């Protein structure tokens, strides 16, 4: 998280939209004002250096500065006025003094820059009004090497100016001499330069806002380069690839390739689907533009594909654009007053880094050399915004968090809260309760905190420019020169220590409890112990090795003064780095961890901060490190809806265990949008600064010091016991290092079941089971214990299913379903999906992966509706489970809805039920129960159940033998059809119903017919008993052996005798 400190140096005049100029490399900035017309020259951070009034020789008339331009290398400014004159503002160079290299601090360099700019000179170029024909100088442009100047007036004239850098006795002066006098069609809106070689030649382009883009070279002729059918709006040029882009007022863009003679050939032509359109270079070969709408548009010249970069907030309209190619940041300014900063990791590769709300109509956005954002807003308002990190501090009693340019919220865990507004800005904050101190560059102001009356009593200031300072209970430590001085709150000098220039100047100073860490500008680190009288240094300076240029930006020290966490930045532009550095001074070892693998960039890193008069803190609590980084279930959500309403780039609070064997990743925790920042670590409680309920982040009062328990400290809300807490710390440490046996040993002495559920979760994540049985048995959770025991009994060869069962018992659902996806067990996964009240997921999983447990899903839904007593869906879901022969009749009979079933079966329910075969057979059986024989026969015929029809027909009085014989012979013909098909592919299938017919003949003496129909039916046992009748015994053979029934053959062998 970052915030833009705002400097708004007012001027008596009115600001101009496009008249802000920023030097590319030197931290300089200048802008024009009118009535009274002047120019304000300021540094990158926004402090005013100088102001320059009307050009020399003016006869009482103030002249409006109409054009400004910076020299690409020299700290030289050129100003074209409105009366035809031209002036050059030049300050004496700092390096001409040939002083020492003691300018290692920004404040000293700013001071020498200011004292150099005080004696600056504004020189007049002779005869400028003659060359511009008494016309206002509309535009100006230096060459790439800064040797040639081009000026354009309002009288349609273009003049070439030669720069002569002559040496003098004390400095180097500059003379501008006119060379040409070139006529233009219209006053030139923009002058661009083309270099001969990609990285002294004459190659310029002039755009006058009309239908002409006139090139010019050393030939002194204004030959056009490219002319289009419409009036041009703007031109955007890439010097490295010599790529020109012409944009018209009608949302038309053309891409040209500039040759040696400044001639363009069209290769990419495109159309875009009051604020004038703006267009800037987002990346080499990638152009970003906006048409005053809510969307950005990004064009890739290499591929020709145009994408739209969306803004989630409606009503926003882009007003101006700028880009910083060094870090890849676009600064979108809006009419409302919203500044959006985009940082690179074609539209999918960009992201919104941050959002800022200045709150005024942004006329123009400019970017200085160091990355500061100058803003012309409100017509006559200049605001320089400098990105600084959120300066937050915590001592052990209260937290002081910076939330704006100057507002600081100081709040304690006891309920005390107060607001601090510094007279100047805020750059550093140090708290050692009740002492508070703020550093704003030039001076450090230290006050007290009156907790009883919520007052802040100002003690005093020290006029020091040290970037490193720290206030303590006994006094304040601040750097002054090459030395550091530790004093009291009443400016009583207690001690001081001095360092040589070869040892550098301290840049980082961090104190906590009674330990101090000092880091210089050349990676020199010193650790010391503060006392009541002296500062006992522990060892000499130690160099550190980092396996462009690495500069350490921050240093934190644990409460032992033994291990140091280090934040470093890359390059002179201070690009944040994705590495955390841990240094063990006692063992003199250097370890690091990379945040690039997690796609995260850190902001701050914090050690554990023990409370005052609390000496029961072990070294495992001291080695813990915390850092902030940034990249069907209807009665379920309402339980956490209170938290969801308490909610009214992602945050990652990540904690490591700093080990002498290396850095081990302990735990990770996402945050929410109302938890703005982490102010420090107070074991076992995170100290996230948060906004209150239904609050606003920009409000100063709307801030509370929120305290959330660690993810490894579940179930410990008393925060009183010490032995349990330290044993849990050791358990977490041994779980992270993988020493699960020592974790078991540590939790064995803990009577809190929270340690046991932590160990059970560790067993889930480590594949341990017999220890997990003890974990479940210690928490008095017999449900999970018996579930694990049955899982072991049912699956003795699979530990994955047992682990999934344990995780499900431990309220770990997502881990369990992922494990069961890994473990192939889709049926158990479907059962779990049903058991969590998600029948839609069960249906999808059944229809996608395992298409064999969809009937259980339907049946379980039917039972769910039956218990819910929504029978309208219960009946249709019992039908969908293909169990309409046992359950839908049951659900009709039990609810006494028999009349509706009778009406349904008499022939949404009537569309499906009457034609179902199983329902018809059930109703036939039910009517046969009611002795309604004829209705049963009718329904059996409608359901095509030959066995039951033959049984009833043969059981009737008189027996309807003819139709029974017809059906029996039809089934015999079907069986013979099957056997003939089998033989053509190369004793048919017996027909059971024929058995009944034989029984009739068995009661009528028709022995031969009874035997024939028994044999056709497959009644070998009855075949024997009917073969015994007259005399035949061979027919007894070939029957028993067909059944492979040993008893039959045995008995026949006995009976043959």
């Amino acid at each position: 998280m970052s915030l833009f400190v705002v400097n708004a140096p007012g001027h008596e005049g009115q600001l101009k939209e496009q008249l802000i100029v920023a030097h590319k490399r030197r931290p300089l900035l200048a802008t024009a004002w009118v009535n009274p017309p002047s120019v304000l020259i300021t540094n990158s951070e926004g402090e005013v250096l100088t102001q320059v009034a009307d050009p020399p020789g003016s006869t009482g008339r103030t002249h409006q500065p109409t054009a400004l331009t910076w020299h690409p290398n020299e700290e030289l400014l050129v100003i074209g006025w409105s009366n035809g004159e031209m002036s050059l503002w030049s300050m004496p160079s700092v390096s001409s003094l040939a002083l020492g290299e003691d300018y290692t601090t920004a404040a000293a360099r700013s001071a020498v820059q200011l004292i150099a700019a005080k004696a600056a000179t504004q020189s007049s170029a002779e005869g400028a009004t003659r060359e511009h024909a008494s016309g206002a100088v509309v535009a100006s442009e230096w060459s790439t090497r800064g040797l040639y100047l081009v000026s354009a007036s309002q009288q349609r004239h273009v003049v070439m100016w030669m720069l002569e850098k002559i040496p003098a006795e004390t400095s180097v002066t500059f003379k501008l001499k006119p060379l040409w006098s070139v006529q233009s069609r219209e006053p030139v809106a923009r002058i661009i330069h083309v270099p001969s070689k990609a990285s002294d030649d004459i190659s310029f382009l002039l755009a006058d806002g009309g239908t002409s883009v006139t090139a010019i070279n050393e030939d002194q002729q204004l030959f056009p380069c490219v002319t289009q059918q419409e009036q041009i709006a703007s031109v955007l040029y890439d010097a490295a690839t010599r790529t020109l882009v012409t944009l018209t007022t009608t949302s038309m863009i053309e891409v040209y390739a500039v040759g040696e003679d400044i001639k363009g050939t069209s290769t990419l032509r495109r159309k875009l689907s009051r604020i004038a359109m703006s267009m800037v270079w987002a990346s080499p070969g990638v152009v970003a533009f906006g048409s005053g709408d809510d969307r950005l548009r990004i064009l890739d010249l290499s591929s020709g594909s145009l994408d739209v970069l969306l803004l989630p907030q409606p009503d926003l309209h882009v007003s101006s654009l700028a880009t910083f190619a060094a870090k890849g940041t676009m600064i979108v300014g809006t009419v409302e007053g919203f500044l959006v900063v985009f940082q690179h990791h074609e539209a999918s590769q960009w992201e919104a880094m941050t959002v800022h709300q200045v709150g005024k109509c942004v006329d123009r956005v400019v970017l200085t050399a160091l990355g500061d954002v100058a803003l012309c807003c409100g017509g006559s308002e200049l605001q320089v915004l400098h990105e600084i990190i959120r300066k937050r501090a915590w001592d052990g009693v209260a937290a002081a968090t910076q939330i704006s340019s100057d507002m600081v919220v100081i709040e304690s865990i006891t309920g005390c809260q107060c607001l601090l507004q510094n007279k100047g800005n805020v750059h550093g904050v140090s708290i050692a309760f009740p002492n508070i101190a703020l550093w704003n560059g030039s001076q450090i102001d230290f006050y007290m905190i009156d907790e009883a009356t919520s007052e802040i009593t100002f003690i005093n200031f020290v006029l020091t420019t040290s970037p490193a300072f720290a206030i303590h209970r006994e006094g304040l430590i601040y750097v002054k020169g090459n030395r550091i001085v530790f004093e009291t709150m009443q400016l009583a000098p207690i001690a001081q220590m001095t360092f040589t220039e070869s040892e550098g100047v301290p840049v980082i100073m961090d104190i906590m409890n009674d330990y101090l860490v000092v880091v210089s500008s050349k990676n020199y680190l010193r650790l010391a112990r503060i006392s009541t009288r002296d500062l006992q240094q522990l060892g000499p300076a130690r160099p550190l090795t980092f396996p462009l240029e690495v500069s350490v930006s921050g240093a934190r020290v644990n409460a032992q003064g033994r291990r140091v966490a280090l934040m470093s930045t890359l390059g002179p532009l201070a690009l944040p780095d994705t590495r955390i550095w841990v240094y063990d001074s006692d063992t003199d070892k250097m370890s690091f961890f990379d945040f690039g693998s997690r796609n995260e960039i850190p902001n701050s890193v914090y050690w554990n901060t023990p409370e005052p008069n609390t000496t029961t803190v072990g070294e495992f609590e001291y080695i813990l490190l915390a850092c902030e980084t940034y990249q069907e279930n209807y009665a379920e959500k309402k339980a956490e809806l209170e938290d969801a309403r308490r909610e009214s780039r992602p945050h990652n609070i990540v904690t490591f265990f700093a080990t002498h064997d290396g850095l081990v990743l302990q735990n990770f925790a996402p945050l929410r949008r109302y938890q703005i920042c982490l102010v420090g670590l107070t074991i076992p409680d995170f100290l996230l600064a948060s906004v209150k309920i239904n609050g606003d982040p920009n409000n100063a009062e709307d801030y509370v010091i929120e305290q959330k328990r660690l993810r490894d400290f579940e179930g410990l809300k008393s925060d009183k016991d010490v032995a349990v807490r330290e044993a849990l710390m050791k358990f977490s440490y041994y779980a992270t290092i993988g020493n699960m046996d020592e974790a078991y040993r540590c939790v064995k002495s803990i009577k809190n079941p929270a340690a046991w559920q932590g160990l059970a979760r560790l067993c889930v994540t480590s594949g341990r089971l017999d220890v997990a049985a003890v974990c479940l048995a210690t928490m008095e959770d017999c449900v999970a214990a018996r579930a694990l025991r049955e899982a072991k009994e049912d699956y003795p060869d699979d530990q994955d299913v047992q682990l999934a069962t344990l995780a499900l018992g431990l309220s770990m659902t997502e881990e369990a379903v992922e494990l069961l996806r890994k473990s192939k067990r889709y049926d158990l996964l479907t059962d779990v999906y049903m058991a969590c009240g998600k029948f839609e997921h069960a249906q999808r999983h059944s229809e996608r992966f395992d298409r064999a447990r969809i009937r259980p899903v339907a049946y379980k839904y039917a039972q769910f509706m039956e218990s819910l007593q929504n029978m309208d869906a219960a009946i249709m879901w019992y039908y969908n489970a293909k169990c309409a022969s046992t359950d839908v009749p049951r659900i009709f009979f039990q609810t006494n809805r028999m009349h509706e079933l009778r009406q349904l079966m008499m022939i949404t329910f009537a569309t499906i039920f009457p034609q179902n075969r199983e329902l018809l057979l059930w109703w036939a059986q039910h009517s046969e129960r009611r002795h309604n024989v004829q209705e049963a026969l009718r329904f059996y015929n409608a359901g095509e159940d030959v066995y039951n029809i033959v049984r009833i027909l043969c059981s009737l009085t008189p027996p309807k033998l003819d139709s029974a014989l017809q059906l029996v012979n039809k089934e015999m013909d079907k069986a013979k059809m099957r056997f003939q098909q089998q033989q053509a592919f190369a004793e048919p299938d017996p027909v059971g119903s024929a058995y009944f017919v034989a029984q009739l003949y068995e009661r009528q003496g028709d022995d031969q017919l009874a035997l024939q129909y028994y044999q056709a039916a497959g009644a070998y046992r009855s075949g024997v008993r009917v073969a015994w009748k007259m005399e035949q015994y061979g027919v007894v053979a070939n029957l028993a052996m067909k059944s492979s029934d040993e008893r039959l053959m045995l008995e026949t062998a006995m009976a043959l005798e």
Binding site: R851, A852, F985, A986
Partner: protein
């Protein structure tokens, strides 16, 4: 195919290997005819169970009863693909 038919009857055996080139060329009927002239039934069974045709595959199975698992295993999965688990 013209070359394979130009290979004489005693040289049909190498056509078996030539039939492999018909699968990589997605020439199914050419592979079938080459194999039936080869009298290679395992690869014919493989082609038939890959194309989903079962009548010819089962006739071939009845010709050589030893290759039953070469057809039943692809069919048992295929029946499970059409929800015929019974």
């Amino acid at each position: 195919m013209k070359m394979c038919r130009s290979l004489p009857t005693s040289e049909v055996t190498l056509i078996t290997e030539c039939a492999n080139f018909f699968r990589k060329h997605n020439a199914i009927p050419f592979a079938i005819e080459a194999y039936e002239k080869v009298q290679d039934h395992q690869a014919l069974i493989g082609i038939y169970v890959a194309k989903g045709d079962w009548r010819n595959a089962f006739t071939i199975l009845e010709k050589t009863p030893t290759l039953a698992r070469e057809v039943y295993v692809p069919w048992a999965t295929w029946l499970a693909d059409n929800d015929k688990f019974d």
